[PDB]
Symmetry: C4
């Protein structure tokens, strides 16, 4: 049967290490594919790492220029937890340069979009075979979440966006079931721009924390109802701004508008909005994608004045970070859903340009009800060795 979001989030008193692949370190001497936009996603019997390959190894020569986001050589691949996406272990889910993937409890739905900027198309795969296609509707880079979607009794919502990435665009929430479109609706609510949504589900409710790439430094939130196939948007009120770049933390935030200071930019990110048990993610730097932390910000979603009451350093401020998304092993044993997340430790261009490539590692963690000590999880590689 299809998995149903019947549990709530477990209490998050800290975060324990869940997974790390050290792909860039290892890939300096093994056949590791170049990637970006990774994520983690579970099936009923296993969890795996996911990402968009560049169709080349890091040590390979075609790794030169992998700083590019959309090429015909990209594809969503998945592989064994905490292992490196290698040419021999990676499994191609589908071909494209933007994806999302989730398991409905019975089987998996993976979606890859591919094509030219002005005329791309998305293909929904279910049970490893293509079932539905969706053509661009705004003709300007059709794109999806870049992280696991969430299903409920067969329904798996997926947030898409088509149009400008620096002004109003056409965002849509699609409701699929066995790869077939049951219904889709345009973005409603007060969020003024939706990009790469990070989602999670619990108690029949799916919460996606995305990124306002044009005006907000205070990421938008899209709360979805998988049963009524309806949703709503907004922002995280809290003054603890979580995008990047982003102006410094104010004392009050905006709930239904983008908090200004930075335009036309940002980084995929996530959060766990669950009352007092609410945790946020943010790069530590406000200027670039470096260092990453988790901060317990009670009621951030609604308390336009909320500040951290606890936190945890994930990646030091002197180490490279990047994309961060949420996933949960919905098939795990227990009375609740252990909240997990991943951080993308980008290496290479643009920041480290003595190499011609751009790749990343992965570090993943899940919540603990204990109050555990922390450690920073760097990619670990030495660009020097790559010169």
């Amino acid at each position: 049967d299809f998995n149903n979001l019947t549990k709530g989030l477990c209490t998050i008193n800290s975060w324990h290490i869940y997974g790390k692949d050290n792909a860039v370190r290892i890939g300096e001497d093994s056949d590791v594919l170049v990637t970006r936009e990774p994520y983690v996603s579970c099936d009923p019997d296993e969890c795996r790492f996911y990402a968009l390959s560049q169709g080349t190894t890091i040590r390979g020569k075609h790794s030169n220029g992998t700083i590019h986001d959309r090429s015909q050589y990209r594809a969503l691949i998945s592989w064994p937890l905490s292992s490196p996406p290698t040419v021999y272990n990676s499994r191609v889910e589908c071909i494209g340069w933007s994806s999302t993937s989730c398991h409905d409890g019975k089987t998996r739905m993976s979606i890859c979009i591919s094509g030219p900027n002005n005329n791309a198309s998305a293909v929904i795969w279910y049970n490893r075979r293509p079932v539905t296609e969706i053509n661009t509707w705004a003709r300007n880079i059709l794109r999806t979440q870049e992280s696991e979607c969430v299903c409920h009794n067969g329904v798996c919502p997926v947030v898409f966006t088509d149009g400008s990435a620096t002004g109003p665009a056409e965002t849509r929430i699609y409701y699929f079931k066995e790869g077939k479109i049951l219904k889709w609706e345009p973005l409603a609510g007060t969020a003024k721009h939706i990009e790469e949504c990070s989602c999670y589900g619990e108690r029949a409710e799916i919460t996606c924390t995305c990124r306002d790439n044009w005006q907000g430094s205070n990421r938008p939130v899209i709360r979805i109802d998988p049963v009524a196939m309806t949703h709503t948007s907004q922002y995280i009120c809290s003054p603890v701004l979580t995008d990047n770049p982003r102006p410094n933390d104010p004392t009050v935030g905006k709930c239904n508008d983008p908090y200004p200071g930075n335009n036309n930019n940002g980084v995929k990110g996530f959060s766990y909005l669950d009352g007092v048990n609410t945790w946020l993610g943010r790069t530590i730097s406000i200027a670039s994608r470096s260092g990453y932390e988790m901060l317990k910000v009670p009621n951030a979603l609604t308390d336009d004045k909320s500040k951290p009451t606890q936190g945890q350093t994930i990646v030091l401020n002197t180490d490279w970070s990047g994309y961060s998304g949420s996933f949960m092993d919905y098939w795990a044993e227990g009375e609740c859903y252990r909240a997990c997340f991943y951080v993308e430790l980008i290496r290479g261009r643009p920041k480290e340009d003595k190499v011609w490539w751009t790749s990343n590692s992965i570090v993943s963690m899940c919540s603990s009800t204990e109050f555990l000590g922390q450690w920073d999880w760097p990619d670990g590689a030495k660009i020097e060795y790559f010169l």
Copy 2:
């Protein structure tokens, strides 16, 4: 039970990306085997890429001279969809330099022919064990389809050819069932020469579009009946000639004779003859194997005057193409058979001779009922990196 061709072809209003392995790109730095004559074929629980290995990696030194078609080091290998045929992932189906393979719904039948030009032999494997052998009957390079065959209630027809490749030869249609020969018949119909057939089945009918290597630029078609174990040959009337090389498109074509202009040459190819829902494949160039397109030519099979009413670019005219064959996931969910095909993106010799090898990548697509945007799918490699 054995799968039965009980559906018709789905409407083809466009073509979506199905698979791509970027083997030559990746193989520049990983252990990827040298190949040619690839194809795609599905089982009830998965689909895979297939090809004739050269028994050597691309970066390997024995890759030197892999421009040769028949050596004792060749063999039909299959591997995971959209992955590169590597030394560690490729599975040897059988040994030979010409094959065909299909699944009857219960298990798979793969056939490899091997041996000296004047005295080769074919071996039919069923359920991964050899069952039947067939010796040359014309003593001049025994050869098969080079792409998936099609079964119906246990019967899987396979088109063979023995004799000259530049004049009359002995072509036969064999009817196997569990690897055993039930019956074989000589080529009947008006087709004057049959080489490397591309087939597909629907509504108890198997249609193979082959290539008249000696006189036709307008590929022959062999329509087979798996129940009555009888067939018939002809050509595609349409003036939209689909072989290569080939003279320019006339206004009227030949239905029961080879359309002249080019002799003793051509390229394996496919087509989907289904009334108005009829689609053709052809290299874009008329001189060499470069660029590839799909064109909706209603009734091409019977309308000796038919012209394109719609089309789609698969590979740009400035990129290398090659062999193209048809396959369909006959075990997919749905009311019809989604038509798919693959294009072989040959790299190396003879066209690109600064390297001593000849290999290829793979790009595969299946039909969509939507009207999707297009993108060209190049191999992606840079021979420069290989020097």
Copy 3:
């Protein structure tokens, strides 16, 4: 159902070769991960090699400095028996720099501890998903056995230690069941210091032979009761001292105190205390970790005067050895539990410093009731080839 320790140890009249991976030899030309602290552990349907990867290949450049014990790039990996821990075959059980792992008959429990020296945390995984966490309690390198634990009717005891490694510390015996803590107790008995325990079970009794890293050269023994969840500590009376370094063998040993001569040092080790059928392991050298032997010392556990009555050379005195732990295929056929053990053949730093790395191979053997001839099992590699 959960496996139950219902058999006794088979008679040990000699030791036959069980497993060897020649990872350092092979890894000189293949992608083999750098490791340390290996072990062997069985499931109901297979046995595998285990170890703490360094997140890098031996030939890789990040192998430089792998002499370090705790980094964020370490992780417990398992792979196919007698094969080398490669980047493509190794499976990540969990992330950390100290582990233990056992199967309760139904599924496996693996534990990895990770973090900064002054504030680490342990994570218990059961059935491949995290279930329980345990924070440092003495704030000075939380650590576990470094070898397989043993379960009984669902209960799997694990010996931990936190605090100084050169003076009194806090050792605890935890009793888990399906990853959940049922109960834990502090170290009782007369053992004055517990480090890296090697355990085995038979007839409802679990016996762990650990290492007194601060004062004893005569390793301590912790006998555990999985049903009553109670234990007891002591030392091996025998004068045949089995740690390293260690003073020369006296005529009488200590039963309830550390036998002096060497302080603040040692090597993980094991033993089989079973009446007259009692066998010990020890490096042959008394100065460093080189050469390894097995010696039948009847009643060593209680006979403060016992001497060898038989023995077997495992690794010559002129070859590098290291850690040694016990495991038994508790799911094997037969009336008893064939005692097995592994020896870690460390290569590289500190002893062989012309290379910048530190890795190891593995050699494993199990007891025979026959009286078999012996052979020494060297790592086999040549550091010269690595320069």
Copy 4:
């Protein structure tokens, strides 16, 4: 249930290609292990290649000196049919420098012998776990078949030899069942010396064709009865001598004595003694291990004057050959047992000494009832590329 030899041999009117791995070619650029003494053996659901690894890749530096037969780094490995024994695909069955392996229909029994020349020991594994050990009985290199054994209703006979390899020695026929010794008997019959036996079974009878390494150029035959656990020895009467080196073919051969001309040497080999349907194998050269042929010698086993009535070239006289053994897919479909065999194409030392290694490829073929054309199957590699 256990497989039972209930069929007879199919008629052998020719031989078709079954398997080839091109390991040395491929291994010039991929991580292929160095091996010798290969063979092929089937289980109820698959067939695989087997051999004794050298614990190193061909391109690896430890490949230097792999000309040696017994080292502590050797081990019996098995892998996917027609693929190369790679570091990532090879599976270690057991550790040793002499093996044999067969499947009784329920599970597999593999045996590896290891140790010093004057005091080795054999370990019998059943269902992948060690069960029985057997110590040397003549104290001079304990050794087995080097090719698949044959079982009947649970009983799997294995021919061993201990003592001189150039004079009388102690050969024994062991009868195992689930790895346990049921009974063993010393070599009886008129064969004066037994080494590396090649066996096959049909109609409750197991026939092993071995090699008289001290006096015979006309290989001995040991016919075994798996039910009565009794056997008998002899030689192949035929004057078509099949060992190597060997004097030229006489007109009459010896039935119960070694045919003289060459002493203290030979090559593992096989044959199919089945009345008129009797086929022999022999290197084509009489001086070294080069070229290989199959010859239909009716009644060779009993007709001390029999000459070839038909034959087939397997490997040309100008290509390297070596060991040859028999195997049959006893679980194949059909009314008879298709006779198969493998030839070891040794490369490197001693013949080709510009390299410091010694490895091999594999070529395998099975009988056809057809009269198929032939082709020679060379290893394919170019030692030049290895310099």
